[PDB]
Design a protein around this ligand. Structure first.
Ligand SMILES: O=P(O)(O)[C@H](O)c1cccc2ccccc12
Length: 106
């Protein structure tokens, strides 16, 4: 759980996530989950996007974790695990820049 997850990069900075995601070869939705730099207990979901307006770019979303157990970006849409959250957002874009597609290559 989490650390076993290949999309879990653990303790890497926001800048490092952008370095990895800003690769021209990455299609929209390339992603990774990492620790937040300053929000304790929260993780960050970093996602690549692309459009003709900005071109290749990166968005960061905070994944909150309750002691009650749930994981969520928006409190209205919660999951029993980080894994289920990733699987859901791989199917639904909802408010994200793109549905999660491919785990970010190192
Ligand atoms: O700096 P990170 O790691 O991206 C971090 O989780 C973060 C992202 C976006 C806004 C933030 C605001 C406050 C504290 C941390 C924040």
């Amino acid at each position: 759980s989490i650390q076993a997850e290949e999309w879990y990069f653990g303790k890497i900075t926001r800048r490092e996530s952008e370095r990895l995601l800003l690769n021209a070869e990455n299609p929209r939705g390339t992603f990774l989950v990492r620790e937040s730099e300053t929000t304790k207990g929260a993780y960050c979901l970093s996602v690549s996007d692309f459009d003709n307006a900005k071109g290749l770019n990166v968005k960061h979303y905070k994944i909150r974790k309750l002691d009650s157990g749930g994981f969520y970006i928006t409190s209205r849409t919660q999951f029993n695990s980080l894994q289920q959250l990733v699987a859901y957002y791989s199917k639904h874009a909802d408010g994200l820049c793109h549905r999660l597609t491919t785990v970010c290559p190192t």
